[PDB]
Amino acid sequence: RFASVYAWNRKRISNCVADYSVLYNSASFSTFKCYGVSPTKLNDLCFTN
Amino acid sequence: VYADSFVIRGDEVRQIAPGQTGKIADYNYKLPDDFTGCVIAWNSNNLDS
Numbered sequence: 631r632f633a634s635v636y637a638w639n640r641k642r643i644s645n646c647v648a649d650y651s652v653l654y655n656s657a658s659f660s661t662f663k664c665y666g667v668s669p670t671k672l673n674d675l676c677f678t679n
Numbered sequence: 680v681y682a683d684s685f686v687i688r689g690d691e692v693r694q695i696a697p698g699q700t701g702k703i704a705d706y707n708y709k710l711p712d713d714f715t716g717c718v719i720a721w722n723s724n725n726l727d728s
Contacts, residue, residue: 654702660690662700669700 642679649673680716683708686723694718 633639650672654662662669685708693699695710696718704710 644679692720694720 650669653659654669654672664672667675687694687703691701691703693701693704695701695704695708696714698712
Protein backbone atom coordinates (compact mmCIF):
# COMPACT_ATOMS: atom_id res chain seq x y z
CA ARG A 631 0.00 0.00 0.00
CA PHE A 632 2.68 2.51 -0.98
CA ALA A 633 1.47 5.81 -2.41
CA SER A 634 2.04 7.64 -5.70
CA VAL A 635 5.39 8.72 -7.12
CA TYR A 636 4.83 12.40 -6.33
CA ALA A 637 3.44 11.56 -2.87
CA TRP A 638 6.09 9.19 -1.53
CA ASN A 639 5.35 8.31 2.08
CA ARG A 640 8.24 9.35 4.33
CA LYS A 641 8.99 7.41 7.52
CA ARG A 642 11.50 8.48 10.17
CA ILE A 643 13.22 5.48 11.78
CA SER A 644 14.20 6.58 15.29
CA ASN A 645 15.44 4.94 18.50
CA CYS A 646 15.97 1.31 17.49
CA VAL A 647 18.66 -1.19 16.50
CA ALA A 648 18.92 -1.73 12.74
CA ASP A 649 19.41 -5.11 11.03
CA TYR A 650 20.51 -4.28 7.46
CA SER A 651 21.96 -7.81 7.28
CA VAL A 652 18.42 -9.18 6.88
CA LEU A 653 17.74 -6.75 4.02
CA TYR A 654 20.98 -7.74 2.27
CA ASN A 655 20.31 -11.46 2.73
CA SER A 656 16.94 -11.15 0.96
CA ALA A 657 17.13 -12.14 -2.71
CA SER A 658 13.95 -10.30 -3.72
CA PHE A 659 15.79 -6.97 -4.12
CA SER A 660 17.35 -6.92 -7.59
CA THR A 661 19.07 -3.54 -7.12
CA PHE A 662 20.94 -2.67 -3.92
CA LYS A 663 23.27 0.13 -5.04
CA CYS A 664 24.38 1.96 -1.89
CA TYR A 665 25.76 5.47 -2.44
CA GLY A 666 28.22 6.97 0.03
CA VAL A 667 28.40 3.81 2.17
CA SER A 668 29.36 0.22 1.43
CA PRO A 669 26.43 -2.21 1.83
CA THR A 670 28.60 -4.62 3.82
CA LYS A 671 29.65 -1.91 6.30
CA LEU A 672 26.03 -0.84 6.91
CA ASN A 673 25.78 -3.39 9.74
CA ASP A 674 28.42 -1.71 11.94
CA LEU A 675 27.96 2.08 11.51
CA CYS A 676 26.00 4.55 13.61
CA PHE A 677 24.01 7.45 12.15
CA THR A 678 20.78 9.38 12.76
CA ASN A 679 17.34 10.17 11.29
CA VAL B 680 46.91 -16.65 -19.20
CA TYR B 681 44.54 -18.79 -17.10
CA ALA B 682 41.30 -19.51 -18.96
CA ASP B 683 38.41 -20.01 -16.53
CA SER B 684 35.25 -21.62 -17.93
CA PHE B 685 31.94 -22.06 -16.08
CA VAL B 686 28.25 -21.14 -16.29
CA ILE B 687 26.09 -18.77 -14.24
CA ARG B 688 22.47 -17.65 -14.41
CA GLY B 689 21.15 -15.29 -17.06
CA ASP B 690 20.31 -12.34 -14.83
CA GLU B 691 23.71 -11.71 -13.23
CA VAL B 692 26.41 -11.62 -15.95
CA ARG B 693 28.64 -9.54 -13.64
CA GLN B 694 31.57 -11.85 -12.74
CA ILE B 695 32.43 -9.52 -9.82
CA ALA B 696 33.97 -7.27 -12.43
CA PRO B 697 35.74 -4.40 -10.57
CA GLY B 698 34.87 -5.47 -7.04
CA GLN B 699 31.18 -6.17 -7.51
CA THR B 700 29.40 -6.84 -4.22
CA GLY B 701 26.82 -9.21 -5.71
CA LYS B 702 26.38 -12.24 -3.46
CA ILE B 703 25.76 -14.78 -6.25
CA ALA B 704 29.53 -15.09 -6.77
CA ASP B 705 30.49 -13.80 -3.31
CA TYR B 706 30.28 -17.41 -2.09
CA ASN B 707 31.23 -19.05 -5.42
CA TYR B 708 33.93 -17.20 -7.38
CA LYS B 709 35.64 -13.92 -6.46
CA LEU B 710 37.76 -12.07 -9.00
CA PRO B 711 40.60 -9.81 -7.79
CA ASP B 712 40.37 -6.03 -8.02
CA ASP B 713 43.63 -5.68 -9.99
CA PHE B 714 42.41 -7.92 -12.81
CA THR B 715 44.38 -7.50 -16.05
CA GLY B 716 42.28 -9.77 -18.24
CA CYS B 717 38.99 -10.00 -20.11
CA VAL B 718 35.44 -11.20 -19.45
CA ILE B 719 33.32 -12.88 -22.14
CA ALA B 720 29.75 -14.16 -21.78
CA TRP B 721 28.01 -16.53 -24.21
CA ASN B 722 24.35 -17.44 -24.67
CA SER B 723 23.52 -21.11 -24.15
CA ASN B 724 19.73 -21.22 -24.64
CA ASN B 725 20.00 -22.83 -28.08
CA LEU B 726 22.87 -25.17 -27.12
CA ASP B 727 21.46 -27.20 -24.22
CA SER B 728 20.39 -24.46 -21.80
